[PDB]
Each structure stands twice: as C-alpha cells, then as structure tokens.
Amino acid sequence: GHMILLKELKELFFLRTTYYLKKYNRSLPFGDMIVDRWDKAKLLGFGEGTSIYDSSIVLGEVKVGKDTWIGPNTILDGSGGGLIIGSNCSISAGVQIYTHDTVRKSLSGGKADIDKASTRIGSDCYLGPNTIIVKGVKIGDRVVVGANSLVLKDIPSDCKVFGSPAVIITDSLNYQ
Amino acid sequence: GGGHMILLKELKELFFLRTTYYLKKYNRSLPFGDMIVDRWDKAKLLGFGEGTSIYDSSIVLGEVKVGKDTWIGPNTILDGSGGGLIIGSNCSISAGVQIYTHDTVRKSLSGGKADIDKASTRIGSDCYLGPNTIIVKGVKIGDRVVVGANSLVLKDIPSDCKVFGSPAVIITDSLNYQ
Amino acid sequence: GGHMILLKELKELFFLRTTYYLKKYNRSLPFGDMIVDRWDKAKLLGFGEGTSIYDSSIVLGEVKVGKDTWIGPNTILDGSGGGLIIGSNCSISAGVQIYTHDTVRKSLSGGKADIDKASTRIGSDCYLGPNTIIVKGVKIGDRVVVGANSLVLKDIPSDCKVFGSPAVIITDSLNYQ
C-alpha cells in the first residue's frame, strides 16, 4: 500500500497539474499545488495580501508587511536577531536574506560560534532574482536591488543598486 | 482516527523506499517531489516536444513552448505570462535558470499602483544556458548560443555567440563548442 | 473521489506539520522538508556523522561527504562525472551547485557530442557562500572561503579566500580560523 500511496500521489499530481493549467494557466511543483500561498503567509503571521511559495524557508523571527510577494526558492532567515520586511515588496525567486553566517564556525573546524546580526528591508522595495542580502543590512524604503546582486552594506531609501558586491547606481525615482 | 499520523508514517516509508529505488536503479537521490513526478511525463503533460524533460521543482507560467530533446533543470522558472516564451530543441536549461516575460519593479516601487510590465522572450535551438542564468523580458536569443553560468542577459543575443557576465556581454563566438 | 480525500488530508498534514515546525523548531519549511529529516537523509546517502542535507538537494552519482558538514537547500551535489568528495565541517550554502560534468558541447552540437566530465573535490573546514557554482575538475583545498555568488573555474589552494564570477584569490582565510 506504499505502491498504492505512490499511485494515488502520481494521480493527484496529474489532476492538480490539469486543474492548475486550465484554471490558473500554470504548472507548479507538487508541493505548490497543495499549499496555498496566501494561507501559508497567514499561518506564518504575515500581513494581509502577502503570499509565499511552498519552496521558501522561513527561519526564526520574520515579520512581513502587507501585499508583499515572497517568491519560490527563497530564504527568509531571521534566526540572528530577527528579519523585518515591509509592504508591497517583490522578493523575487531565489532571493536569500540572512541574519547569520557560519563562515567562522566552518573555517575554525567547528569551534567558533555562528555570527548574527538583524536585517531589515523597508516598503515598496524590489529585490531582483537571486539577490543575496547578508546579515546586518538595513535597506530603506523604495529601493531597487537588481538581479544577481550581493548586498553587504546599508542602502538608503530611493536608491537603485546593482552588482556583487552591490553599489549605488542611481536613484529609483523613475520606477516610482 | 489518527489519520494524518498514518499518512505521515506512510509518506516517510515511501520516501525511504523511493530513495532506495532511485539509488539502485538511477544512482541518484532526489527531492521527494522528483521521485513522484517523472520528468518526461511532466514535459508531455505541459505539451513540450518529444525527448524534453522537466523537473518537478520547475515553475511554468502562461504560454510556454519548448522544442524536442530540451532538458529543463531543477529550480528553474519558465515564465511565459507576458506574451509567451518560446524555447527550441536540444537546449540545456541549467539548474536555477530563470527566464522571464514580465517584471514587477514599478508595481513595487510605486507602492502597488503601477501595472506589471511585459514582453515576450524567445530562445533558439542548440543553446546552453549555464547555472543561475537570468533572462529578462523582451530578450531574443538566436540559435547555438552559450550563456555562461551566473549571467544576466538584458539584450538580444545573435546566433553563434558566447556571452558571460552580469550584465552579459558577447565575449566570442560559440563555434569551438559546435 | 479518493484523490479529493488525499488532497484534503495532505492539506491538513501541511497545516499540522507547519504548526509543529513553527512552534517546536521556530521555522517554516517546504512540505518535502517536513517529511524528510535532514540527518536521516544524510545517513541514508552514506555521509559522515553529524552531516545533514535538505530534501530539496539533488545528489547525483558518487558523492562522499565527511562529518559535520551542512548541505543546504536547493543545492546540487553532482558526482556523476568521476565523483565528488567533500570534507568535514563544511558549509555548503543554499543554492550551491557543484558539478563534475557539463552539457555545453552536447547542446551546441545539436545533441551529437558527448557529455564532458571531470572529478571535483573540496577539503575540510570550507565555506561555500550562497549560490556559489563549482565547475567540473576543480580542487578546493582545506580552510577555503568562497564568497557568495562566486563561479569557481580553477583549483583553490588551502587557506585562501576567493570571490567573484569568475572567482579570484582576494586574500588568505586565516582571520576566519
């Protein structure tokens, strides 16, 4: 009856895929056709209108505002002092936001502690695909962070940044 | 009674048995979803061409056409929601590759007031997109193109080119690879 | 019918397991990672004691991992092209992809060329930051820092810190030890 569960799961996958294509014009991972993104967000205590894919990892204390879109394959790590994210943010596919790292733990052969620092992002921000935000970063409001960036330092409001490591390119007023 | 306890136990047993089978038959260990979902059958169900495969972990939005013998890797995004995405035959769409026809920059930056911006995207045949390549909306990639890993492609790429970088630049031709 | 009942039970189990992880483990994980235990998975794959690996990781072919190594989510450990060896006390961050093959020629030749392969090795006490990509044939010594978003195309000696796409030696890693 593990053969039975497997067959029932393959059937359900087929049926959910068919449903999703016909009704929502998309095909998702199996996990994402069980989990509703808005119900998941609500269960995690996020603000109304916020949505989060099944494939996201949310660690520790994470607060998120209203109407924020948390994409697939994301990491929201508030384990090292908490992570706060505002309203109307785009947290694109693959974005990873941290409040700790294990560099010293590893390099020390297992001896050093994990290093921790809180991180914060304002409202009306766009974090592009595969952006990495390290511990301790404060991102102000209305910020654009381009795809593939690595943010190592605070970003003031109304800035657009880009690069690994990210640098301020211009202001974001043209997008507003 | 105790229904979800029984379901959890059977899921754990199934995971152990599927992992065992995949190790023995296919010398790999995959996410649980990828040991339920068959990559070729999934491609079939999405109407992709013969020989095409796609992992469970992929997201396919809107109108996406894919040719024959194309490999769509894990953790990928094939977003055809903003006027369609077309991909040719014999392409490597590596793990982590994200291909877009829309973005939500202005929508966010305007505090939720601006529309989503959209533009169709197209990729030819015999192309390699390396791990974690990001292709933005409006981009047209010709045939026989190499995009190196970690690239961000902001503009059209002619056939027979090799590109690299964030943003990506043409560094040479791809003839060495053909 | 029977599939609608399975769906409802899966939704219930998702809610229950999420509550469990939030309240006991202070986290919310993908559904797949709330079925598979990371240490038991690592044990099933033959990895050293103390090692863990997320459900979302793909492990291909022959792969050896030492003790107390953390293999993150959304990772690729590809030992299909002559094997991959990883030491002990390593952090293999989220998104890291480690290869021993590629399919560039196969695609660019229209499906005619063979897959190219080369073994890869990483020492002990190493850190690979988020989204690092390691290509085939690479050897990384002990006590190396690879910064986030790096692409590693060549061997890295012990006690180095590297960064970039492609990655270059920036300094030594002694300060982290």
Please tell me if residue C141 touches chain A, with a CB cutoff of 8 Å. Answer: no
Q: Resolution of the deposited coordinates, in angstroms? A: 1.8
Is residue A113 a known part of a binding site? no
Neighbouring chains of B at 3+ CB pairs under 8 Å are A, C
The CA radius of gyration of chain A, in Å to the nearest whole number, is 18
Closest CA to B174 of C170, C113, A25: C113
Quickly list DSSP for A55-118.
T-EEEEEEEE-TT-EE-TT-EEEEEEEEEEE-SS-EE-TT-EE-SEE-HHHHHTTS-SPPEE--
Taking the mean position of all CA atoms in its chain, how far away is CA A149? 14
Instruction: Name the residue facing B132 among A21, A130, A163 (closest C-beta).
Output: A130
> Which residues of chain C are within 8 Å of residue A131 when distances are taken between CB atoms?
none
Chain A interface mutation, best of C9, C15, C27, C128, highest count of A Cβ atoms under 10 Å: C27
Amino acid, res. A128: G
Residues written for chain A: 176
Structural element, H or E, at residue A16:
helix A2-24
| Phi, psi (rounded to 5 degrees) for A151 | -95, 120
Distance CA C63, CA C78 (A): 7
Give the DSSP letter of residue A155.
B
Closest by CA position to B95, among listed A127, C57, C30, A20 = C57
Distance between CA B70 and CA B93 in Å, rounded? 8
Closest Cβ opposite residue B177 in set C57, C104, C165: C104
* Distance between CA atoms of residues C156 and C145, nearest Å: 10
Breaks (C-N over 2.5 A) in chain B follow: none
Backbone phi and psi for residue A16, each to the nearest 5 degrees, phi listed first: -65, -40
Asked whether the beta carbons of B42 and B70 are under 8 A apart, the reply is: no
Cis, peptide link before residue C130, omega less than 30° from 0:
no
Q: Give me the helices (H) in C26-151, please.
A: 38-45, 104-108
3-state secondary structure A23-70: HHCEECCHHHHCCCHHHHHHHCCCCCCCEECCCCEEEEEEEECCCCEE
CA distances from C25 to A59, A62, A80 (A): 9, 14, 14
Topology at the third CATH level for domain A36-175: UDP N-Acetylglucosamine Acyltransferase; domain 1 (2.160.10)
Q: A107, A135, A145: best mutation site toward chain C, by most C Cβ within 10 Å?
A: A107
**Whole-number Å distance between alpha carbons of B131 and B148:** 8
Count Cβ–Cβ pairs < 8 Å, chain A vs chain B: 120
Considering only CB atoms, B56 lies closest to which of A29, A69, A94, namely: A29
Quick one: tokens of C170? 């920036």
Where are chain A's structural domains?
1-34, 36-175
Method: X-ray
H helical segments located in C1-98:
2-25, 38-45
Cβ neighbours around C155 below 10 Å, total: 12
Q: Is B82 helix (H, G, I), strand (E, B) or coil?
A: strand
Q: For residue C61, give the H/E element and its range.
A: strand C58-65
Contact criterion met (CB below 8 Å) for A82 and A61: yes
Is there a contact between C85 and C122 (Cβ–Cβ < 8 Å)?
yes
* Pair B74, C58: CB distance under 8 Å: yes
Nearest partner of C122 among C96, C102, C104, C148, judged by Cα: C96
Peptide bond into C166 cis (omega under 30): yes
Closest CA to B124 of C113, C112, C107: C107
Phi, psi of B16, deg, nearest 5? -65, -45
Residues A60 and A54: beta-carbon distance below 8 Å: no
Return the structure tokens found at C117: 């392969």
- Residue A50 phi/psi, 5° resolution? -75, 145
For residue A175, give the amino acid letter: Y
Which H or E element spans position B147?
A: strand B146-147
Classify domain B38-177 at the CATH class level: mainly beta
Say which DSSP state C157 is in: -
Q: What is the spatial distance between Cα A137 and Cα A160, in angstroms, rounded to a whole number?
A: 15
Sign of CA dihedral A29, A33, A34, A40: positive
Domain spanning C37-176, CATH class: mainly beta
φ/ψ (deg, to 5) at C105: -60, -45
CA distances to B73, B145, C121 from C7, rounded to whole Å, are 27, 43, 43
A75 contacts in C (CB within 8 Å)?
Answer: 73, 94, 130
Residues C25, B166: Cα–Cα separation, whole Å: 38
For residues C14 and C30, what is the distance between their CA atoms, to the nearest angstrom? 9
Measured distance CA(A43)–CA(A58) in Å, rounded: 12
Please tell me if residue B159 touches chain C, with a CB cutoff of 8 Å: no
d(C-alpha A23, C-alpha B79), whole Å: 17
User: What is the Cα–Cα distance from C84 to C144, expressed in whole angstroms?
Assistant: 17
In whole angstroms, what is the distance from residue B102 CA to residue B84 CA? Answer: 10
Neighbours of A67 (CB within 10 A): 19
Hey, are the CB atoms on A109 and C126 less than 8 Å from each other?
no
Does the beta-carbon distance from B109 to A21 stay under 8 Å?
no
Query: Which chain C residues are Cβ-neighbours of A57 within 8 angstroms?
Result: 27-30, 33, 73, 94
Taking a C-beta distance cutoff of 8 angstroms, is the pair C56, C74 a contact? yes
Residues 6 or more apart from C152 whose CB is under 8 A from it?
C132, C133, C134, C135, C138, C140, C146, C162, C166, C167
Q: Which amino acid belongs to residue C100?
A: T
Instruction: Respond yes or no on whether the N-terminal peptide bond of residue A165 is cis (omega within 30° of 0).
Output: yes
